[PDB]
Design a binder for this molecule. Structure first.
Ligand SMILES: CCCCCCCCCCCCCCCCCC(=O)O
Lengths: 48, 45, 249, 292, 96, 249, 249
């Protein structure tokens, strides 16, 4: 969760709303196991 | 006693998969920069 | 142990200075190099016009707007009609080179927004079909969208990079951000990446160069509205072989 | 002798990175948490520098995440119907070798831009009712330029040079190992270019992206028969990739495929992440709070 | 390799807008900005990540994760955020 | 070469003395120990509140009657709401500990009866269904029978340990008898037994602690009728990790 | 030979980062330490819950206004009902600890004002009597003003620190300023100061933590009006002895 520790303070004549971009990744001790088939994309017919 | 990784045919591409050369070098995708940045440092100083 | 904010890139008779620079991305940690004799296949002696073609070319300037989607270029295609590089690409069948792409976008400390500058190898452009089966013309993109030239082409669906792949994972490619609060330029040095030592600079485009606004440009009334984005590139270690009559396309 | 060679063939385990013990740090000038994502580099922050960790001698094996193990798994790449009944009394069929017809093998392959590998092709052939009567089949590989058969009796089936496999349906599935056959250094799943010169002003422009370095001919299959048999045969081709070399990883495809040889997504773009109610809702009930 | 999380995966948000966590000047104190689960293979913000898509090719995973937040506001805009990771057993925290 | 009848157990600020003790059972010959760094998996530094939680807790006293069936407790569950141990179990996700269970039952030299005090790891409680097929509610025991708390739960069918396993073989578990003619206490030191280095003290109960009267309590008119059975336990080498808001259940 | 503006304080599972920090005040040049055996008096073994209690607690956020007088807290009292620290303070008679107080207040470069953050040992609160002689109730402050809890108490007369001593000399105490043009935080590490090695965390408050606006907060129309002040503290080297039933107050 992301909370406002303090406010988002701006001077006059500057946008009061901005964006935060989150970039996710793994650490050096990351590991995977038991390779399987994904469920991301489906197919109902050959691509001919 | 393991009896595997033996090729029975004259052509080398007939051998089984080469699963004894695991190498990990993530620096070419995670730190593709010129000036190496120390972890404990402010990157843009 | 850190990176300085100022930088100067000098190649050929051109020099680019920047005072708010993040770093310089060396794609895949490999510098551009000439084709080694161990990997070459053509027997003709290549030509290496050192300083006449390996130099910075300021090519196109697009105006960043609040509803902009982004633009993309193809590296060999964007330089095929400019300078001594364009001539050597037209007169020779074979060509290979790296490049140093430099995207410039400055704004006041009162603007905001972030661009994603990535160099995509083999950036095959997709067409979005309206669910039509019978292999209509709208199944393949026209030549204006695959080889945009020096003007570039603005994205239709930046969310899928106009290629069906998610934009969020485009950071797997050599990339850099232009965050207006942090830096005003993005530098990417890219070596020659191809399954062949040489290739035609006219048919094959080795890299796609995308500039996509992730966080839209926002400012308040009174600030400068026209915020341009300039693309400057420079071939590195460019060779050509197979001389013949100049071929345009 | 070579006894030392065969002994060192078991898959040796290399473990994941260990975690070293760490303590609290109170000072200035040392900020491992602050990063600059604009530099295009991923954060080098370690757990040791953001929390107080213990010493963990990690022993989790990482060998299964290699490219070889990820790819050396035979998946379906082609379904060939040898029609010999009804309106098509051919008894033969010439299938253009293309591994981009089925999603599971295609999505895995398109993780990388260039790939150089050998393959082990396996043919699982049977009738429509899944039975396998003894029926002599001939699977002839027709390289690009070799004459393709046009009937079940034509001379091309003599195979005096073309590699050919003869096997009944009742036999175990035929299996052959195919080398890296390509004029290039690697197969190129993405070719941002055109195969020939020209204006490329065609109305369809179907040649865009077609690199002939990947086109490796056809697989001609027939039943070795004197006349029509009245039985349709389905040949499922499975490709296992070995001795893999991959280059330039790419984003995994997120939109549904539409055609075989082209990236082409529908105009109704599907989101990569499934929707939720708002940006502050998660579906995890958890336990009862001790003192709310 | 760090890739963009699709945190704003809300109904109605379309295109590149789904990759942005909106932050603004608050009228009250200690407000919730955004939240998401850190299960990589779960349907949600992690689907748009390279780690999230490779995890779906495997049954089990292990190791520490990493989220890098980049603020894309004005140079003149200041602020402080508390980004908390709540271990299992508890639902999403209701207060800071 | 023998065992003395007197004993004193001192841990924390608590001390238990006994003058008619059989011995002290060290379950499976292993002492309670902290998680070695070779077997740990969580990277957070554990907390080890040495003397505030590793101490004797006198929890419940049940009255032994001539028709009593017996009682059982679950070790982590019986201490989740008492003292500093309960707080650390509520504030932390992960927990591990051994214990030293001490059951006290004294009677005159004119009473008789024998209890079976056993520490059963993974004491999964069964429900006795009235031969009903369609997966009714009476197919699984309610939460009051699986996690009895500090009051414990009295056995329904002690002959099958309320688990379908014969009571006669419960001596395969670390056990001790309280034979009123011989001793008045039973001590069992149990190390942390689990397939995981740490686990939740709220969901998972590592051990069941049963006290079953095999030989019923018998006495003659005039003797003290109220013969209590007191359960005193003490965690040993207890660690906690994964701090967050206190969770009750 | 100088102090860096960035700092990170990591204790327990909490981490506080700041990018505009003046320095870190080490009160009286002494670090927090455990009670040496030469100075201890109680014979019970103390408990040292290392990482469960020695951690940063964000407790209260007060809104700085142009007419604000200031607020004060009492260090042991402000943590007596939060987390594992509060429990150990309630379950044990004796307690000792240092702390690292961290006050956070950020504002734009267009705001102005300065706070005085001081840690006052034995901050005895005075009552202002309306010149009444006969020892009325208005001669002594109520419990809400002496032990404000976690919400703190706002000053009545900041000029005399609500104690009859001049505010101008409060800089004799370990202090730090939060000048909005210079820094946005104030850090004070305070060792355990008391005439006794241990003491009750309920009756006695070792330190008062005051935050007083000397130069009032001023800004122009259009700037963010709500400028909060957040108090985050963390006990250091906290011990407890004399375990008994949990006592609230
Ligand atoms: C005896 C019969 C054996 C069959 C021989 C099979 C030969 C196959 C060639 C190797 C296949 C890999 C390359 C495929 C690339 C084409 C994909 C595409 O771009 O559409």
């Amino acid at each position: 969760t992301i909370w406002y520790q303090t406010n988002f303070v701006v001077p006059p004549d500057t946008p009061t709303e901005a964006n935060i971009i989150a970039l996710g990744a793994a650490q050096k001790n990351f590991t995977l196991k038991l390779c399987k088939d994904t469920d991301e994309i489906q197919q109902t017919a050959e691509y001919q | 006693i393991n009896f595997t990784n033996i090729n029975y045919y004259k052509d080398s591409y007939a051998a089984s998969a080469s699963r004894q050369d695991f190498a990990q070098d993530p620096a070419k995708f995670t730190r593709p920069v010129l000036d190496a940045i120390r972890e404990a440092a402010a990157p843009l100083q | 142990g850190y990176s300085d904010r100022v930088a100067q890139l000098t190649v050929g008779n051109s020099t680019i200075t920047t005072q708010e620079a993040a770093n310089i991305v060396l794609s895949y940690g490999e510098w551009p190099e000439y084709c080694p004799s161990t990997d070459a296949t053509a027997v003709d002696k290549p030509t290496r016009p050192d300083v006449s073609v390996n130099r910075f070319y300021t090519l196109s300037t697009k105006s960043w707007k609040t509803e902009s989607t982004g633009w993309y270029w193809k590296f060999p295609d964007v330089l095929n009609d400019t300078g001594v590089f364009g001539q050597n690409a037209q007169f020779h069948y074979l060509y290979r080179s790296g490049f140093c792409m430099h995207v410039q976008c400055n704004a006041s400390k009162f603007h905001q927004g972030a661009l994603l500058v990535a160099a995509i190898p083999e950036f095959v452009i997709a067409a979005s079909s309206p669910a039509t089966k019978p292999n209509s013309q709208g199944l393949y993109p026209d030549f204006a969208h695959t080889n945009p030239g020096k003007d570039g082409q603005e994205f239709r669906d930046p969310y899928v990079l106009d290629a069906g792949i998610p934009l969020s994972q485009a950071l797997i490619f050599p990339h850099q951000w232009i965050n207006l609060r942090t830096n005003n330029c993005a530098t990417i040095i890219m070596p020659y990446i191809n399954a062949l030592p040489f290739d035609s600079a006219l048919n094959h485009s080795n890299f796609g160069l995308v500039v996509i606004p992730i966080s839209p440009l926002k400012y308040c009334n009174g600030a400068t509205t026209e915020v341009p984005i300039t693309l400057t590139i420079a071939p590195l270690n460019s060779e050509f072989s197979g001389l013949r009559q100049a071929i345009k396309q | 002798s070579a006894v030392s060679a065969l002994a060192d063939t078991t898959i040796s385990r290399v473990t994941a990175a260990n975690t070293a013990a760490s303590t609290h740090s109170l000072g200035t000038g040392r900020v491992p948490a602050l990063q600059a994502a604009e530099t295009g580099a991923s954060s080098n922050s370690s757990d040791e520098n953001l929390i107080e960790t213990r010493c963990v001698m990690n022993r989790n094996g990482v060998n299964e995440a290699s490219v070889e193990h990820f790819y050396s798994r035979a998946g379906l790449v082609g379904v060939v119907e040898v029609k010999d009944s009804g309106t098509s009394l051919d008894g033969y069929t010439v299938w253009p070798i293309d591994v981009m017809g089925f999603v599971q093998q295609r999505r895995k392959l398109e993780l990388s831009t260039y790939m150089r590998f050998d393959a082990e092709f396996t043919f699982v052939s049977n009738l429509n009712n899944s039975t396998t009567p003894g029926m002599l089949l001939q699977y002839m590989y027709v390289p690009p330029g070799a004459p393709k058969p046009d009937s079940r009796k034509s001379y091309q089936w003599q195979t005096a040079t073309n590699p050919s496999v003869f096997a009944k349906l009742s036999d175990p599935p035929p299996q052959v190992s195919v080398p890296f056959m390509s004029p290039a250094t690697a197969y190129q799943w993405f070719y941002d270019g055109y195969p020939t010169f020209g204006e490329h002003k065609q109305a369809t422009n179907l040649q865009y992206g077609q690199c002939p370095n990947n086109m490796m001919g056809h697989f001609a299959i027939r039943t070795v028969s004197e006349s029509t048999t009245g039985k349709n045969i389905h040949v499922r081709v499975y490709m296992r990739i070995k001795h893999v070399r991959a280059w330039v990883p790419r984003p995994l495809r997120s939109q549904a495929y539409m055609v075989k040889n082209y990236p082409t997504y529908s105009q109704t773009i599907t989101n990569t992440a499934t929707d939720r109610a708002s940006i502050t809702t998660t579906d995890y009930e958890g336990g009862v709070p001790a003192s709310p | 390799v760090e890739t963009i999380l699709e945190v704003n995966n809300t109904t109605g948000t379309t295109g590149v807008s789904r990759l942005l966590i909106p932050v603004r000047a608050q009228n009250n104190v200690d407000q919730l900005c955004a939240s998401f689960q850190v299960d990589p293979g779960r349907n949600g913000p992690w689907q748009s990540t390279m780690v999230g898509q490779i995890c779906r090719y495997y049954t089990q995973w292990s190791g520490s994760l990493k989220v890098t937040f980049m603020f894309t506001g004005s140079f003149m805009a200041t602020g402080k955020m508390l980004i908390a990771y709540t271990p299992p057993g508890s639902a999403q925290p209701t207060t800071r």
